[PDB]
């Protein structure tokens, strides 16, 4: 009849030692729209330049050590869906067709 469950999280029991801790660093991260966030890192820790801040947008490191900006590609354009299946000469034929069309529409 009795039923139990478990929140999947460890419950450890030590004392809240306020005095003796691992010493730590503080790194200032800045987002795009002039927002400052200071993140407590450890001493023995490399400080990453890029960061997802408390703001939720991307926040960079306040010293300009220049992480790599994009190094990526655009996914696929509608131009790419067109160009992978058509000819540029064909598109030129359609363009000159529509140009002569707006010609015949506009001045006679």
């Amino acid at each position: 009849r009795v039923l139990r469950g478990s929140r999947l999280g460890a419950v450890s029991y030590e004392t809240d030692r306020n005095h003796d801790l691992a010493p730590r660093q503080i790194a200032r991260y800045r987002t795009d729209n002039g927002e400052e966030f200071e993140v407590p890192f450890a001493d023995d820790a490399e400080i990453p330049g890029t960061w997802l801040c408390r703001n939720g947008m991307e926040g960079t490191l306040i010293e300009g050590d220049l992480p790599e900006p994009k190094k990526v590609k655009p996914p696929r354009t509608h131009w790419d869906m067109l160009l992978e299946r058509r000819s540029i000469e064909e598109l030129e034929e359609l363009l000159k067709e529509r140009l002569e069309l707006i010609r015949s529409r506009r001045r006679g």
Binding site: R4, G5, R7, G9, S12, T15, L21, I47, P48, G56
Partner: protein, 1266 residues
């Protein structure tokens, strides 16, 4: 301002939240609709359980597992991105969602009234077309640009309009030419004429089509031009084709949007203060419904104006996220997961947000965009309050999903379920059994139950004794029960009080504190004298045991809730430890006097002496243990240890007949001598036959004269003697002792022939069905009383059945009559009487049909009892809802106003007969005025407790009217003062400065509703407190003069001639169901009536007698009216409880004229606040508002509360909470309701600051001596 909440609370300010504050609260943006992996069962990044955002689940262990120590704390590992900490910050930390599109909060749109609708002054049924993307709305316009361009613009409008004219000119010309061609092709040939006319008709209908097509185009152009000229903000373009063909022209002159961003823009280009002054001018100059609507708008407009709020926060941009432990996904055994039904709504919101965001980043056509925006809006609406608009979103099998607002509202709402109760540790329950040998301040207790209750205590004590190395082997020994642990359990239970409670808790004595003691068995032994307080018969009713822990808790249990300290009623001062069912019969047998008995005194002396006296009661005991003396025989003892009565005592010894030394004789029985041995030494001899009423008077006398601990011992000794002589009383029931009256049968013959004549006359048809039924009812009631009379005279007094009744232990005479004799009338299931009736007794045995008739009333009574106890619980709820904030805070308000009491009116001869309802009214009161005896001395000075002897002195002095204080005239602002409350009904002394008299009054009124056996009952009481219009609504007078009395066609047409020159007040709608009031004789046409004389019989509304004869008269009326019902059920309630309740009704006043200081007419404000602001405002703004005293109902008084948290749990919790946030009304935490909810030490009893801050030190002399 303290979010870590360290114990110095004073206020609780609710406020509307800005989106800036929302993103200030959050520790990250959730942006993926994920919960947890299916496979590794760890939470996902950017999800609804994201440990980067919400926090770690493992105490001081990060997600990537780089750091796993508590020494690593307050750092964030660069890989996992998690602040390593304790894993209960996931209870506190919130997340947020930055939206792509604005959203309106639903509580400002779909309530009553619409807050957005008043703030914008638009129709809600048109605002819904705005925010749900059904209508565009102009949010701004450049008026001066149109104003200086508009002549040129209407010139090009004429150019536009002239083009359609040229079009129809060309079309009508070409069509006229084509019809001329049709005429030339019809007239050049030979044919039938009608076909040519139809070709003509075709041409004409074509040019008809031309001309009205042109006309319609011109209509469209003039309409769109009229719209452009009359263009203004807050204008709605419904059906959107006008908008779509409109904007392309002149779009540089206006902005018109659709949906929530348009609402945002309208709030942005908005002054509150210009429209504030505009509404002030309108209420300055308006009239009627226009100014009423202006007031209703000015309410919320000045609400936004006065506070530091902003209506910008009414629309929403960032949606917060509740911490995930409040909505957890706990697994069960086997991976069956248990979500919390909010996660589905959050997933809908995240999915629709990301879909909208991808649509915007792609570039999408308009319909899909507005569709996704409306879906997002409805998703946030379902997130906040599912089912508020349209159709509730359901899950599996069409069960609607619990929204976020559903946590607070309804049955399972957070406020009410917190207010309902909490299951507690250190408690237990069992079935109870009688404990008749035990002391009053005790309770027996099952040892295996107390072994579990007191387990940390016994573990500590057998750690102190060297029986275990630690607490762990101590706990194991407690499980293994090594028999020294019972001795240690005795030691720890010694002097440690426990609580006891029978559910339900009807009143204050439902919880009492007893000293436990370890008893064999497994049931809770209850002392028998508290069964009346608990209403606990031993038919299997269980009781719940609690246990105090702190020293303060042990003190409160030991001193307040102890058995010996709570003896009297809190309601009406009479005791509840009083002897009862068995021991009353025991003592009645023990003290009754029986002449014609063995060893009875005779004074007659032949050769013998009188041979009846006995020198000592010890000698009497010896001669009674030998079989000479019966106990109930009359003798003449010589007493040396008992106090003689006042006649004999004053006769012999004058100054003091002091029983420790004196010796005196009396003619009594042995039993009464042994009885007065139980009573204390100072008490005089009684020498009466102990009826229950006599014993009640005795115990009242003891409690009013002697200290309480004496009375507890006396009642215990009475219990022992009552049981010991209930044994020997010989009261048994044999069916040979249920004697029948012998001439019952001829009485049945008599009334049977009478009923036979009546029914035969009905069979003649001379009288109808109703009159013969009523005649049968009256004849059989006469026969019933005849049989009961014959039964009553037939029984001898030693018949045990009549002995129990005449003693007053239990049962009325009617139950004895229905045992032996005749049941009589059994009811209709409707409520009428069955005219048969039952002619037999239970000893005779009924018939099939008679028993079948009896079933109706039996089952109706059971169902009525269930309904009564439920509704009495509800009425007790409402009374606690009203009176929860009335405590004593001062000793004396020192007014001199106060009510008068009738107080033992005289005769027409002048003989002061005692008024029967003095004990409920005049006692336990303090005289605010003096009393003098025909300008003689002051008999009773100002402010005396008004108990029995001084009231007897007032009856001696012959005065009947005293101006006495009341809580109706207490002059304290915050509650009552003590002297106007008088004697506390249970202590017997003056009330303290911390008593919650409101809750005591509420329980004292609400308790006998079960005994209220029934419009003349509990709904009558309820509508009296709800102050509704009565069903027995009968008119009262307005001024003196004789009546214009008349009973016209089929109902009544009664008017009143005024004594002064005035109008006749016309009373039209009086049905013939009402009857003429009998008063002073029966009312007649031309009776000079009073001002408060009731015209008909019945019950007037109290509103009318308030409006005519003010507050004093309606108070005097309501007390008498409710007390009359409690008289009718034979339940004595002291009147000060009803005084407390009615005082809460008459707190607030209405406004009919505003004065000049922020007053709306018809507003209900407190009287004292009103009078104080008037005495401030008479200087510099001296327009006193015209206030009128108003009587508001108990629910209405509850809803007109002080704080939002004080209400919070009654009725439309949402509507309370929304304008609570709008007003930004801060709480001050002055009631006890809120301090209970937040768990603060409440300001009552032990809780106020006078007792909370007591400095404790020893006396310095004893400090030095020790």
């Amino acid at each position: 301002g303290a979010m870590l909440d360290v114990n110095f609370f004073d206020e609780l300010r609710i406020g509307l939240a800005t989106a800036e504050d929302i993103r200030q609260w959050s520790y990250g943006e959730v942006k993926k609709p994920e919960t947890i992996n299916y496979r590794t069962l760890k939470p996902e990044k950017d999800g609804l359980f994201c440990e980067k955002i919400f926090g770690p689940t493992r105490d001081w262990e990060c997600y990537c597992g780089k750091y796993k120590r508590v020494r690593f704390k307050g750092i964030i590992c660069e890989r996992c991105g998690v602040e390593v900490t304790r894993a209960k910050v996931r209870r506190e930390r919130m997340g947020h969602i930055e939206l792509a599109a604005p959203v309106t909060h639903i509580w400002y749109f779909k309530g009553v009234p619409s807050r957005l609708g008043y703030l914008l002054d638009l129709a809600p049924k048109d605002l819904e077309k705005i925010i749900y993307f059904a209508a565009y709305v102009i949010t701004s316009v450049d008026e001066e640009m149109r104003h200086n361009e508009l002549s040129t613009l209407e010139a090009e409008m004429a150019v536009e309009r002239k083009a359609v004219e040229d079009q129809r000119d060309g079309e009508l010309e070409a069509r006229a030419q084509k019809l001329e061609a049709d005429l030339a092709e019809l007239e050049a040939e030979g044919a039938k004429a009608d076909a040519r006319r139809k070709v003509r008709d075709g041409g004409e209908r074509e040019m008809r089509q031309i001309r009205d097509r042109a006309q319609r185009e011109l209509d469209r152009l003039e309409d769109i031009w009229s719209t452009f000229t009359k263009l203004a903000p807050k204008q709605l373009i419904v059906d959107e084709n006008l908008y779509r063909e409109l904007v392309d022209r002149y779009g540089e002159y206006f902005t018109g949007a659709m949906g929530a961003e348009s609402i945002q823009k309208l709030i942005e280009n908005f002054d509150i203060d210009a429209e504030a002054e505009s509404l002030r001018d309108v209420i300055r100059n308006g009239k009627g419904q226009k100014k009423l609507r202006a007031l209703k708008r000015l309410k919320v407009v000045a609400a936004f104006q006065q506070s530091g709020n902003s209506p910008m926060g009414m629309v929403l941009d960032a949606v917060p996220v509740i911490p995930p432990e409040l909505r957890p996904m706990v697994q069960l055994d086997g991976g069956r997961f248990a979500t919390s039904d909010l996660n589905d709504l959050y997933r809908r919101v995240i999915n629709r947000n990301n879909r909208l965001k991808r649509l915007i980043d792609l570039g999408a056509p308009e319909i899909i965009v507005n569709n996704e925006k409306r879906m997002l809006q409805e998703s946030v609406d379902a997130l906040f309050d599912n089912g508020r608009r349209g159709r509730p979103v359901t899950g599996p099998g069409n069960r609607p999903l619990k929204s976020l607002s559903d946590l607070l509202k309804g049955k399972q709402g957070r406020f009410r379920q917190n207010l309902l109760g909490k299951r507690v540790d250190y408690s237990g329950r069992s079935v109870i059994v009688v404990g008749p040998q035990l002391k009053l301040h005790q309770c027996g207790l099952p040892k295996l139950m107390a072994l579990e209750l007191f387990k940390p205590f016994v573990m500590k004590r057998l750690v102190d004794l060297n029986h275990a190395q630690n607490i762990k082997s101590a706990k194991r020994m407690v499980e293994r029960q090594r028999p020294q642990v019972w001795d240690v359990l005795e030691e720890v239970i010694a002097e440690h009080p426990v609580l006891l409670n029978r559910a339900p808790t009807l009143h204050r004595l439902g919880i009492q504190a007893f000293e436990p003691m370890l008893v064999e068995g497994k049931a809770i032994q209850l002392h028998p004298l508290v069964c009346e307080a608990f209403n606990a018969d031993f038919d299997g009713d269980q009781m719940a045991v609690h246990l105090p822990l702190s020293a303060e808790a042990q003190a409160e249990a030991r001193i307040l809730m102890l058995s010996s300290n709570n003896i009297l009623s809190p309601a009406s001062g009479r005791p509840l430890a009083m002897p009862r069912l068995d021991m009353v019969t025991g003592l009645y047998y023990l003290t009754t006097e029986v002449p014609g008995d063995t060893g009875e005194y005779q004074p007659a002396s032949g050769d013998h002496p009188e041979t009846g006296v006995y020198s000592s009661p010890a000698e009497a005991i010896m001669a009674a243990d030998r079989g000479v003396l019966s106990v109930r025989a009359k003798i003449k003892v010589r007493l040396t240890q008992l106090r003689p009565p006042v006649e004999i005592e004053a006769e012999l010894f004058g100054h003091s007949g002091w029983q420790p030394g004196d010796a005196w004789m009396a003619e009594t029985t042995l039993g009464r001598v042994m009885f007065n041995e139980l009573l204390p030494l100072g008490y005089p001899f009684v020498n009466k036959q102990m009826h229950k009423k006599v014993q009640a008077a005795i115990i009242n006398d003891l409690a009013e004269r002697y200290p309480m601990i004496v009375v507890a011992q006396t009642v215990d000794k009475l219990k022992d003697a009552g049981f010991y002589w209930a044994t020997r009383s010989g009261v048994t029931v044999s069916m040979a002792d249920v004697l029948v009256p012998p001439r019952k049968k001829e009485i049945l013959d008599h009334y049977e022939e009478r009923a036979d004549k009546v029914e035969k006359q009905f069979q003649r048809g001379a009288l109808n069905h109703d009159e013969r039924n009523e005649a049968l009812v009256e004849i059989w009631k006469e026969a019933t009383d005849e049989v009961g009379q014959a039964l009553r005279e037939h029984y001898p007094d030693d018949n045990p059945i009549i002995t129990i009744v005449d003693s007053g232990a239990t049962g009325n005479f009617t139950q004895t009559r229905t045992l032996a004799g005749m049941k009589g009338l059994v009811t209709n299931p409707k409520g009428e009487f069955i005219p048969r009736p039952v002619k037999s007794s239970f000893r005779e045995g009924l018939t099939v049909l008679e028993y079948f008739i009896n079933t109706h009333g039996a089952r109706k009574g059971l169902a009525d009892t269930a309904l009564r106890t439920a509704d009495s619980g509800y009425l007790t709820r409402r009374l606690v809802d009203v009176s929860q904030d009335v405590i004593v805070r001062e000793h004396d308000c020192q007014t001199e106003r106060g009510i008068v009491v009738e107080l033992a009116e005289r005769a027409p001869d002048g003989t002061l007969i005692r008024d029967p309802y003095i004990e409920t009214s005049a006692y336990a009161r303090t005289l605010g005025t003096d009393a003098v005896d025909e300008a003689g001395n002051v008999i009773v000075e100002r402010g005396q407790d008004l108990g029995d002897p001084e009231i007897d002195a007032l009856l001696a002095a012959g005065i009947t009217q005293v101006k006495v204080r009341s809580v109706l005239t207490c002059a304290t602002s915050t509650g009552v003062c003590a002297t106007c409350y008088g004697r506390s009904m249970a202590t017997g002394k003056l009330v303290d400065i911390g008593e919650a008299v409101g809750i005591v009054a509420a329980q004292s009124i609400g308790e006998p509703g079960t005994q209220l056996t029934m419009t003349g009952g509990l709904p009558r009481v309820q509508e009296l407190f709800e102050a509704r219009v009565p069903r027995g609504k009968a008119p009262i007078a307005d001024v003196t003069g004789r009546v214009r009395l008349e009973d016209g066609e089929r109902f009544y047409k009664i008017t009143i001639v005024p004594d002064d020159g005035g109008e006749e007040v016309v009373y039209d709608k009086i049905s013939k169901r009402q009857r003429l009031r009998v008063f002073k004789r029966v009312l007649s046409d031309g009776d000079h009536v009073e001002v408060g004389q009731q015209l008909m019989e019945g019950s007037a509304d109290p509103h009318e007698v308030l409006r005519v004869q003010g507050p004093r008269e309606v108070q005097i009326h309501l007390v008498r009216e409710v007390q009359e019902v409690y008289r009718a059920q034979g339940v004595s309630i002291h009147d000060k409880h009803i005084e407390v309740i009615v005082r809460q009704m008459l707190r607030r006043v209405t406004i009919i004229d505003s004065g000049s200081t922020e007053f709306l007419p018809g507003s209900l404000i407190d009287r004292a606040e009103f009078e104080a602001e008037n005495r401030r405002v008479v200087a510099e703004g001296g327009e006193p508002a015209a206030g009128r005293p108003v009587l508001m109902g108990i629910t209405k008084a509850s809803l007109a509360t002080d704080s939002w948290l004080s209400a919070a749990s009654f009725q439309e919790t949402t509507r309370v909470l929304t304008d609570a946030a709008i007003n930004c009304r801060s709480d001050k935490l002055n009631g006890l309701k809120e301090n209970v909810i937040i768990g603060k030490l409440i300001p009552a009893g032990t809780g106020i600051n006078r007792y909370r801050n007591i400095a404790v030190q020893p006396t310095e002399e004893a400090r030095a001596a020790a």
